[PDB]
Amino acid sequence: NSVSVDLPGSMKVLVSKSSNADGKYDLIATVDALELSGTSDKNNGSGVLEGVKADASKVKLTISDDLGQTTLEVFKSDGSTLVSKKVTSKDKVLADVKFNEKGEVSEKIITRADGTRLEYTGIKSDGSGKAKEVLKGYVLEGTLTAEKTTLVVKEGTVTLSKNISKSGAVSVELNDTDSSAATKKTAAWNSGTSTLTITVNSKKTKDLVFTSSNTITVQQYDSNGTSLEGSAVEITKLDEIKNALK
Numbered sequence: 001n002s003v004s005v006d007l008p009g010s011m012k013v014l015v016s017k018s019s020n021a022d023g024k025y026d027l028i029a030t031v032d033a034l035e036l037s038g039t040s041d042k043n044n045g046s047g048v049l050e051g052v053k054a055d056a057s058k059v060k061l062t063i064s065d066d067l068g069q070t071t072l073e074v075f076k077s078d079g080s081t082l083v084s085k086k087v088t089s090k091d092k093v094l095a096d097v098k099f100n101e102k103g104e105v106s107e108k109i110i111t112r113a114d115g116t117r118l119e120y121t122g123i124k125s126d127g128s129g130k131a132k133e134v135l136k137g138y139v140l141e142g143t144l145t146a147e148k149t150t151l152v153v154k155e156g157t158v159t160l161s162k163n164i165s166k167s168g169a170v171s172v173e174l175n176d177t178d179s180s181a182a183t184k185k186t187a188a189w190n191s192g193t194s195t196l197t198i199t200v201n202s203k204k205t206k207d208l209v210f211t212s213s214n215t216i217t218v219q220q221y222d223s224n225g226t227s228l229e230g231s232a233v234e235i236t237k238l239d240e241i242k243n244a245l246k
Contacts, residue, residue: 002028005045007063009070009088013045029061031072036061057083066090116214118164120144133162135214138238153238155245158185162210170210172196174245185245198244206244207232218244 002014016026020039027038027049036059040047049061056077063070068090074083085097091113098107104125110118116135123129127146132139140151140162149164157177164170174187174196187198196208203225209217209232217232218240235241 002026003045005067007045007067007070008090008092009072009086009094011061011070011072013049013061013063015040015043015045019043031059031061034059112214114214118149120149133164137236138241140238153241153245155242158245160241160245170194172208172210174198208244216241 001017003017005013005015007013011029011031014028019025024039024041025043025047027036027040027045027047029036029049031051034051034053036049036051038047038049038061042065044067046063046065046067048063051059053059053074058075058077058079060073060075061070062073070088072086074085075081076083081101081103082099084099085095087095087097089095093113094109094111096109096111097105100106106123108118108120108123110120112118117133119132119134121130121132123144127144129144131142131144131149131151133149133151140153142149142151142162147166151162151164153160153162159175161173161175162170163172169191171191172187172189174185176185178184182201185198185200187196189196194210194212196210197204198206198208203223204221205225206221207219207228209219211217216235218235219228219232220230221227222229235244
């Protein structure tokens with residue numbers, strides 16, 4: 001009878017082939033080992049299913065009308081306070097959220113469609129916390145405030161800071177405490193190309209590109225300090241970022 005429907009978040013739902021006397025459709029799903037069930041106004045697998053864990057926590061699976069988004073929620077046993085919320089949106093991005101005993105967000109892990117992650121932990125009531133960005137081959141560590149995420153790499157007297165605004169905008173800055181004008185690094189950020197250009201002793205040395213694919217590339221300038229040379233090389237480990245800051 002029933003029809004299997006594929007869902008975001010690596011889940012499936014079975015929907016009845018025909019409606020009941022109220023015109024409603026039956027929904028069944030199994031998530032891990034838990035049986036969920038519900039009824040829906042629609043015939044395509046969308047709607048709400050509910051179940052209860054062995055420890056009496058309430059579970060709810062909400063499937064959006066167009067099947068683009070799924071939300072999997074766990075509540076305390078009276079159903080009033082959230083414990084966890086997993087949302088897969090239609091771009092296949094995953095937001096994995098944990099809550100404290102008061103239902104306030106305490107941890108949020110975002111997995112981008114390409115597998116890279118933003119990990120926010122120890123989140124406090126002012127929206128501050130610890131931050132990590134998990135990239136292909138390396139991780140960046142730092143902090144979260146309500147204004148921005150700041151991830152830091154240090155090499156010698158140079159500190160590289162990657163900022164992700166609350167609006168999602170990336171900006172990068174470099175600060176060097178070297179007092180010698182011969183070796184001190186400075187840098188300019190080009191928001192139009194997401195590129196940090198490093199200068200030493202009044203000549204450009206390197207472009208660091210922070211790409212839309214969540215990678216970093218480095219390309220050197222010629223000794224003339226005005227033309228790029230060669231071709232950009234993709235960073236594959238944290239040691240290679242540090243090398244670019246030497």
